[PDB]
Enzyme design. Structure first.
Site, PDB file in Angstrom:
ATOM      1  N   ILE A 102       0.299   0.248  -3.898  1.00 34.60           N
ATOM      2  CA  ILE A 102       1.082   1.342  -4.464  1.00 34.60           C
ATOM      3  C   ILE A 102       1.353   1.105  -5.938  1.00 34.60           C
ATOM      4  O   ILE A 102       1.118   1.979  -6.780  1.00 34.60           O
ATOM      5  CB  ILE A 102       2.407   1.513  -3.701  1.00 34.60           C
ATOM      6  CG1 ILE A 102       2.169   2.048  -2.298  1.00 34.60           C
ATOM      7  CG2 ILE A 102       3.382   2.390  -4.482  1.00 34.60           C
ATOM      8  CD1 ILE A 102       3.367   1.774  -1.384  1.00 34.60           C
ATOM      9  N   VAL A 142     -10.454  18.701   4.261  1.00 32.38           N
ATOM     10  CA  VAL A 142     -11.626  18.913   3.421  1.00 32.38           C
ATOM     11  C   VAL A 142     -12.874  18.580   4.229  1.00 32.38           C
ATOM     12  O   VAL A 142     -12.967  17.509   4.850  1.00 32.38           O
ATOM     13  CB  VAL A 142     -11.548  18.067   2.138  1.00 32.38           C
ATOM     14  CG1 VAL A 142     -12.801  18.271   1.275  1.00 32.38           C
ATOM     15  CG2 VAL A 142     -10.285  18.388   1.343  1.00 32.38           C
ATOM     16  N   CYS A 171      26.207  -5.396   4.469  1.00 28.80           N
ATOM     17  CA  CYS A 171      27.325  -4.711   5.107  1.00 28.80           C
ATOM     18  C   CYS A 171      27.744  -5.474   6.353  1.00 28.80           C
ATOM     19  O   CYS A 171      26.902  -5.869   7.164  1.00 28.80           O
ATOM     20  CB  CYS A 171      26.964  -3.274   5.482  1.00 28.80           C
ATOM     21  SG  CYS A 171      28.383  -2.341   6.169  1.00 28.80           S
ATOM     22  N   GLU A 204      -4.178  17.883   3.118  1.00 30.78           N
ATOM     23  CA  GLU A 204      -3.936  16.714   3.964  1.00 30.78           C
ATOM     24  C   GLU A 204      -4.268  17.044   5.409  1.00 30.78           C
ATOM     25  O   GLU A 204      -3.782  18.046   5.945  1.00 30.78           O
ATOM     26  CB  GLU A 204      -2.484  16.242   3.872  1.00 30.78           C
ATOM     27  CG  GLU A 204      -2.090  15.236   4.959  1.00 30.78           C
ATOM     28  CD  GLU A 204      -2.942  13.971   4.935  1.00 30.78           C
ATOM     29  OE1 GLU A 204      -3.074  13.333   3.858  1.00 30.78           O
ATOM     30  OE2 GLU A 204      -3.488  13.621   5.997  1.00 30.78           O
ATOM     31  N   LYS A 258      15.322  -3.231  -1.811  1.00 24.32           N
ATOM     32  CA  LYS A 258      14.554  -4.439  -2.086  1.00 24.32           C
ATOM     33  C   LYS A 258      15.153  -5.125  -3.310  1.00 24.32           C
ATOM     34  O   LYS A 258      15.268  -4.509  -4.380  1.00 24.32           O
ATOM     35  CB  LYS A 258      13.078  -4.117  -2.309  1.00 24.32           C
ATOM     36  CG  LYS A 258      12.237  -5.319  -2.688  1.00 24.32           C
ATOM     37  CD  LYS A 258      10.772  -4.934  -2.674  1.00 24.32           C
ATOM     38  CE  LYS A 258       9.901  -5.932  -3.414  1.00 24.32           C
ATOM     39  NZ  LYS A 258       8.453  -5.613  -3.208  1.00 24.32           N
ATOM     40  N   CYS A 298      26.946  -2.680   9.650  1.00 26.18           N
ATOM     41  CA  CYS A 298      25.613  -2.303  10.096  1.00 26.18           C
ATOM     42  C   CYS A 298      24.521  -3.270   9.660  1.00 26.18           C
ATOM     43  O   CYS A 298      23.348  -3.045   9.988  1.00 26.18           O
ATOM     44  CB  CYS A 298      25.264  -0.899   9.589  1.00 26.18           C
ATOM     45  SG  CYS A 298      25.155  -0.808   7.780  1.00 26.18           S
ATOM     46  N   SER A 333       6.293  -1.966   0.771  1.00 26.11           N
ATOM     47  CA  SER A 333       7.021  -2.652  -0.288  1.00 26.11           C
ATOM     48  C   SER A 333       6.629  -2.098  -1.653  1.00 26.11           C
ATOM     49  O   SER A 333       5.438  -1.942  -1.947  1.00 26.11           O
ATOM     50  CB  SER A 333       6.756  -4.154  -0.229  1.00 26.11           C
ATOM     51  OG  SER A 333       7.851  -4.861  -0.780  1.00 26.11           O
ATOM     52  N   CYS A 375      29.462   1.501   1.964  1.00 21.78           N
ATOM     53  CA  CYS A 375      28.076   1.340   2.380  1.00 21.78           C
ATOM     54  C   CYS A 375      27.366   2.695   2.365  1.00 21.78           C
ATOM     55  O   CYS A 375      27.847   3.672   2.944  1.00 21.78           O
ATOM     56  CB  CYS A 375      28.028   0.711   3.772  1.00 21.78           C
ATOM     57  SG  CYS A 375      26.373   0.496   4.495  1.00 21.78           S
TER      58      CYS A 375
HETATM   59  C1  LIG Z   1      -2.003  -4.705   5.958  1.00 23.13           C
HETATM   60  C2  LIG Z   1      -1.714  -3.999   4.658  1.00 23.13           C
HETATM   61  C3  LIG Z   1      -0.473  -4.126   4.058  1.00 23.13           C
HETATM   62  C4  LIG Z   1      -0.197  -3.474   2.867  1.00 23.13           C
HETATM   63  N1  LIG Z   1       1.021  -3.625   2.297  1.00 23.13           N
HETATM   64  C5  LIG Z   1       1.321  -3.012   1.130  1.00 23.13           C
HETATM   65  C6  LIG Z   1       2.643  -3.147   0.482  1.00 23.13           C
HETATM   66  O1  LIG Z   1       3.535  -3.845   0.999  1.00 23.13           O
HETATM   67  N2  LIG Z   1       2.858  -2.510  -0.672  1.00 23.13           N
HETATM   68  C7  LIG Z   1       1.912  -1.744  -1.255  1.00 23.13           C
HETATM   69  O2  LIG Z   1       2.170  -1.182  -2.342  1.00 23.13           O
HETATM   70  N3  LIG Z   1       0.683  -1.567  -0.713  1.00 23.13           N
HETATM   71  C8  LIG Z   1       0.339  -2.154   0.447  1.00 23.13           C
HETATM   72  N4  LIG Z   1      -0.935  -1.981   1.006  1.00 23.13           N
HETATM   73  C9  LIG Z   1      -1.886  -1.106   0.328  1.00 23.13           C
HETATM   74  C10 LIG Z   1      -1.439   0.323   0.664  1.00 23.13           C
HETATM   75  O3  LIG Z   1      -1.377   0.485   2.087  1.00 23.13           O
HETATM   76  C11 LIG Z   1      -2.415   1.349   0.100  1.00 23.13           C
HETATM   77  O4  LIG Z   1      -2.806   0.940  -1.214  1.00 23.13           O
HETATM   78  C12 LIG Z   1      -1.863   2.774   0.052  1.00 23.13           C
HETATM   79  O5  LIG Z   1      -1.490   3.253   1.359  1.00 23.13           O
HETATM   80  C13 LIG Z   1      -2.934   3.678  -0.546  1.00 23.13           C
HETATM   81  O6  LIG Z   1      -2.599   5.045  -0.355  1.00 23.13           O
HETATM   82  P1  LIG Z   1      -3.582   6.223  -0.836  1.00 23.13           P
HETATM   83  O7  LIG Z   1      -2.707   7.368  -1.284  1.00 23.13           O
HETATM   84  O8  LIG Z   1      -4.639   5.658  -1.748  1.00 23.13           O
HETATM   85  O9  LIG Z   1      -4.365   6.594   0.527  1.00 23.13           O
HETATM   86  P2  LIG Z   1      -3.735   6.634   2.031  1.00 23.13           P
HETATM   87  O10 LIG Z   1      -2.252   6.343   2.002  1.00 23.13           O
HETATM   88  O11 LIG Z   1      -4.661   5.879   2.953  1.00 23.13           O
HETATM   89  O12 LIG Z   1      -3.903   8.184   2.369  1.00 23.13           O
HETATM   90  C14 LIG Z   1      -5.208   8.736   2.501  1.00 23.13           C
HETATM   91  C15 LIG Z   1      -4.987  10.151   3.009  1.00 23.13           C
HETATM   92  O13 LIG Z   1      -6.193  10.913   3.005  1.00 23.13           O
HETATM   93  C16 LIG Z   1      -6.131  11.805   4.108  1.00 23.13           C
HETATM   94  N5  LIG Z   1      -7.503  12.310   4.327  1.00 23.13           N
HETATM   95  C17 LIG Z   1      -8.590  11.569   4.602  1.00 23.13           C
HETATM   96  N6  LIG Z   1      -9.693  12.349   4.725  1.00 23.13           N
HETATM   97  C18 LIG Z   1      -9.306  13.619   4.523  1.00 23.13           C
HETATM   98  C19 LIG Z   1      -9.965  14.938   4.520  1.00 23.13           C
HETATM   99  N7  LIG Z   1     -11.290  15.037   4.751  1.00 23.13           N
HETATM  100  N8  LIG Z   1      -9.209  16.027   4.269  1.00 23.13           N
HETATM  101  C20 LIG Z   1      -7.889  15.926   4.023  1.00 23.13           C
HETATM  102  N9  LIG Z   1      -7.221  14.757   4.024  1.00 23.13           N
HETATM  103  C21 LIG Z   1      -7.865  13.590   4.261  1.00 23.13           C
HETATM  104  C22 LIG Z   1      -5.527  10.937   5.208  1.00 23.13           C
HETATM  105  O14 LIG Z   1      -4.932  11.694   6.258  1.00 23.13           O
HETATM  106  C23 LIG Z   1      -4.481  10.139   4.440  1.00 23.13           C
HETATM  107  O15 LIG Z   1      -3.181  10.744   4.442  1.00 23.13           O
HETATM  108  C24 LIG Z   1      -1.238  -2.626   2.228  1.00 23.13           C
HETATM  109  C25 LIG Z   1      -2.483  -2.486   2.836  1.00 23.13           C
HETATM  110  C26 LIG Z   1      -2.750  -3.148   4.033  1.00 23.13           C
HETATM  111  C27 LIG Z   1      -4.087  -3.026   4.712  1.00 23.13           C
HETATM  112 CL   LIG Z   2       6.078  -7.231  -3.186  1.00 18.77          CL
HETATM  113 ZN   LIG Z   3      27.067  -0.277   6.635  1.00 17.03          ZN
END
Ligand SMILES: Cc1cc2nc3c(=O)[nH]c(=O)nc-3n(C[C@H](O)[C@H](O)[C@H](O)COP(=O)(O)OP(=O)(O)OC[C@H]3O[C@@H](n4cnc5c(N)ncnc54)[C@H](O)[C@@H]3O)c2cc1C
Ligand SMILES: [Cl-]
Ligand SMILES: [Zn+2]
Ligand SMILES: CC1(C)c2[nH]c3ccccc3c2C[C@@]23CN4CCC[C@]4(C[C@@H]12)C(=O)N3
Ligand SMILES: CC1(C)c2[nH]c3ccccc3c2C[C@@]23CN4CCC[C@]4(C[C@@H]12)C(=O)N3
Length: 664
Positions: A410, A166, A595, A68, A106, A598, A80, A611
């Site tokens: 997710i 990487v 609660c 990472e 949630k 809080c 979420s 709580c």
């Molecule tokens: C506005 C918005 C709202 C969203 N809301 C939701 C939600 O409410 N619920 C939900 O489930 N999903 C949501 N999503 C989708 C969600 O954000 C993604 O699907 C999720 O973060 C994907 O994670 P990942 O593990 O695929 O990659 P990421 O979480 O993007 O992680 C990629 C990682 O790769 C690392 N990396 C990149 N290049 C290199 C390299 N060369 N060497 C080493 N490390 C590297 C980065 O540092 C990063 O940590 C949303 C997306 C958007 C745009």
């Molecule tokens: Cl949801």
């Molecule tokens: Zn409380």
């Protein structure tokens, strides 16, 4: 367990940087290994889910290194999560009592549909979660979830290397036995990169597609895409002046309108906390999960923050996801100085209900460091045409993405991530047990269903997203068609039977119901009709009538044909025991309370009298669940009994699918 301050003291004793204190918890030490079976590029949520699931599926079989580039778990949007995700966490040994110390409760999804042409008018749609003794869902601050999963990974034989990158220019990926030479540096400026020799590389670099972009150009769907802009705000203790009737902050809330929707997510934040201190807090939580400490004897969130010298506060994540065929005024300098801020505040004032709603929240400046008051992201949806090949495969966002709506990111995305994890054991073993060409052919064929699933997954999610969006153009189609079909097709039937062995298989069969035929049949009719009405126009009343009638006719048939018993009238606040809309119906189950001290939301269950967030003890009667319609004494003890522990593995059991029964 007595709380230890191992990492806090180790860091001060050696003046260790953030990435050094984290990498010091690695089983194989803080420096990179010479060789590994699997190198994972990116410790986002999917890289870590992959690695945790691979080692839990078959322990002590694969040496796995996660790389990472962030020096510590960084900020991510996507907070979420859904019942399949909590179930995964539970199968990996962390139940709600502990997860709630870190994340927000949630209790379902709520939608409000704002009438554009009649400002002030709205409809809603509510679907609840589950009793305290069944399951929970989570609102997760991403830097904390990925810290939790790093520590859990490190306690299960996985090495995680933060602050390491990487180098995809010098990395070599090949299908020849152990053909991979993964170049890993601390950055572009780094003279001495290391190589990790390995069998299998996992591209988990998110939307960046760092590896698989080399194998195919990113692919965009026809038609409009979406833009997002968001920020972080205070979380009021008193949610009663909110302009929507029966509003609760423990749902994921969706403010929907013709141009798109707004998410509202209440989650605790741990920003301002030293990383070493958080490592001790998390570690202690896992030790309490290992020991089986009851919830009322587990310290509350705020007490943990005192113990480990952390920072803790409640915030609300509010953001817009709107179509990119919206016409903005040319000059928006009256609304801010940055584009993200400009478009956020321009849209808020477009709807009196959004402005009345936002007037309960105070903006938070730079919660996650400089420049982070506002975020914007353009052209959200995409797909990776190639997701695997000789020496490598991709997971999570690196395969494709659509939209935040219903959180496929997710919760659906972990289907690819857990399945890849399971497939990784035979992939590495094939390479160790046959000559190169046969090994390559056998692996290529083994992955045909994986590539096919990925190829078909994103377009089905895209059609699901467009289905919902075009229905948000009307305050009847939103709840009575789009939302109704998403929960009928997509409710997770038989999730209490899933275990580590069947999880990937069950997950890939879910897809939020987006593959259910009758769902797609209603989705296509709406999209086919509504897409011809230009966005700045109101849908004709006769078009809504026609679509309402068509949907209801298909619905009655597919609902009769479903052999899964549900108290539908207790789960959907607007619908009866079949899925008929009921005009005045307000009754539902009540699984939560706020609660008084809080403002945090709590699960109602007899064994939790305090709580979990501030520790304030509530009165004994309050923790009584409300079942409407009622359940007898035996129907409730029967329900709680199924959700206690997942069944053991029976390799002669048929997997019961989450989707509704085929009509035959
Ligand atoms: C506005 C918005 C709202 C969203 N809301 C939701 C939600 O409410 N619920 C939900 O489930 N999903 C949501 N999503 C989708 C969600 O954000 C993604 O699907 C999720 O973060 C994907 O994670 P990942 O593990 O695929 O990659 P990421 O979480 O993007 O992680 C990629 C990682 O790769 C690392 N990396 C990149 N290049 C290199 C390299 N060369 N060497 C080493 N490390 C590297 C980065 O540092 C990063 O940590 C949303 C997306 C958007 C745009
Ligand atoms: Cl949801
Ligand atoms: Zn409380
Ligand atoms: C399946 C479940 C996880 C679920 N998944 C949803 C998705 C969207 C909206 C609502 C839900 C629910 C509510 C449910 C329905 N029940 C089935 C038996 C016990 C359970 C589990 C739970 C219950 O108590 N509440
Ligand atoms: C159905 C099956 C062909 C299958 N289809 C998948 C799709 C995606 C991922 C995994 C699978 C599997 C593995 C299965 C699961 N089934 C449990 C009972 C019998 C069987 C048949 C087989 C089994 O032993 N292994």
């Amino acid at each position: 367990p007595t709380p230890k301050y191992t990492f806090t003291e180790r860091a001060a004793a050696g003046n260790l940087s953030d990435a050094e204190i984290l990498n010091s918890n690695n089983p194989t030490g803080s420096e990179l290994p010479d060789e590994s079976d699997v190198v994972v590029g990116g410790a986002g949520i999917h890289g870590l889910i992959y690695a945790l699931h691979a080692s839990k599926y078959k322990p002590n079989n694969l040496k796995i290194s996660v790389i990472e580039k962030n020096t510590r778990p960084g900020y991510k949007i996507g907070e979420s999560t859904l019942p399949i995700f909590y179930t995964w966490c539970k199968l990996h040994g962390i139940s709600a009592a502990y997860l709630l110390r870190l994340f927000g409760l949630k209790d379902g999804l709520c939608f409000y549909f704002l009438d554009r042409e009649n400002q002030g008018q709205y409809t809603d749609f509510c679907s609840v979660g589950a009793p305290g003794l069944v399951l929970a869902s989570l609102q997760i601050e991403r830097p904390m979830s990925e810290l939790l999963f790093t520590i859990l990974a490190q306690r299960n034989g996985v090495n995680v290397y933060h602050g390491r990158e990487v180098d995809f220019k010098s990395t070599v990926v090949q299908g020849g036995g152990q053909g991979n030479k993964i170049a890993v540096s601390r950055g572009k400026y780094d003279s001495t990169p290391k190589t990790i020799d390995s069998a299998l590389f996992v591209d988990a670099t998110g939307r960046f597609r760092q590896f698989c972009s080399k194998k195919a150009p990113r692919h965009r769907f026809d038609g409009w895409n979406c833009n997002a802009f968001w920020g972080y705000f205070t979380a009021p203790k008193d949610e009663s002046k909110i302009p929507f009737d029966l509003y609760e902050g423990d749902f994921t809330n969706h403010l929907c309108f013709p141009e798109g929707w707004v998410w509202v997510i209440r989650l605790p934040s741990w920003e301002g906390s030293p990383i070493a201190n958080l490592m001790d807090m998390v570690t202690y939580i896992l030790e309490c999960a290992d020991a089986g400490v009851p919830g009322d004897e587990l310290p509350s969130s705020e007490e943990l923050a005192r113990m480990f010298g952390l920072k803790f506060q409640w915030v609300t994540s509010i953001g817009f996801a709107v179509r990119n065929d919206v016409k903005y005024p040319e000059d928006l300098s009256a609304y801010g100085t940055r584009e993200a801020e400009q478009k956020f505040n321009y849209f808020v004032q477009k709807y009196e209900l959004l402005q009345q709603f936002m007037s309960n929240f105070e903006l938070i400046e730079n919660l996650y460091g400089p420049g982070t008051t506002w975020f914007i992201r353009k052209t959200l949806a995409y797909q990776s045409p190639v997701v695997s090949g000789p020496g490598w495969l991709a997971i999570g966002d690196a395969c494709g993405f659509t939209n935040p709506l219903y959180s496929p990111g997710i919760n659906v995305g972990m289907s690819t991530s857990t399945w890849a994890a399971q497939l990784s054991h035979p992939i590495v073993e094939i390479g160790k047990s046959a000559p190169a060409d046969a090994a390559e052919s056998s692996i290529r064929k083994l992955l045909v269903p994986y590539d096919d699933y990925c190829k078909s997954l994103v377009p089905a999610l895209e059609q699901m997203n467009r289905f919902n969006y075009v229905c948000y153009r009307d305050t009847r189609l939103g709840p009575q068609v789009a939302c109704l079909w998403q929960f009928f097709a997509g409710i997770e039937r038989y999730l209490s039977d899933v275990n580590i062995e069947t999880f990937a298989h069950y997950a890939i069969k879910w897809v939020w119901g987006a593959m259910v035929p009758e769902y797609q049949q209603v989705a296509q009719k709406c999209i086919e009709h509504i897409e011809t009405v230009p966005l700045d126009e109101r849908l004709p009343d006769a078009m809504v009538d026609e679509l309402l009638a068509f949907s209801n006719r298909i619905k009655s048939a597919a609902v009769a044909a479903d052999d899964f018993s549900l108290r539908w009238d207790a789960i959907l606040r607007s619908f009866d025991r079949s899925l008929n809309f009921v005009e005045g119906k307000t009754s539902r189950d009540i699984y939560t309370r706020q609660c008084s001290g809080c403002g945090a939301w709590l699960q109602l269950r007899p064994d939790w009298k305090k709580c979990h967030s501030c520790g304030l003890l509530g009165t004994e009667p309050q923790t009584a669940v409300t079942f409407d319609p009622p359940l007898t004494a035996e129907e409730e003890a029967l329900l709680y009994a199924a959700w206690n522990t997942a069944p053991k593995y029976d390799p002669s059991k048929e997997l019961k699918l989450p989707t509704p029964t085929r009509p035959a």
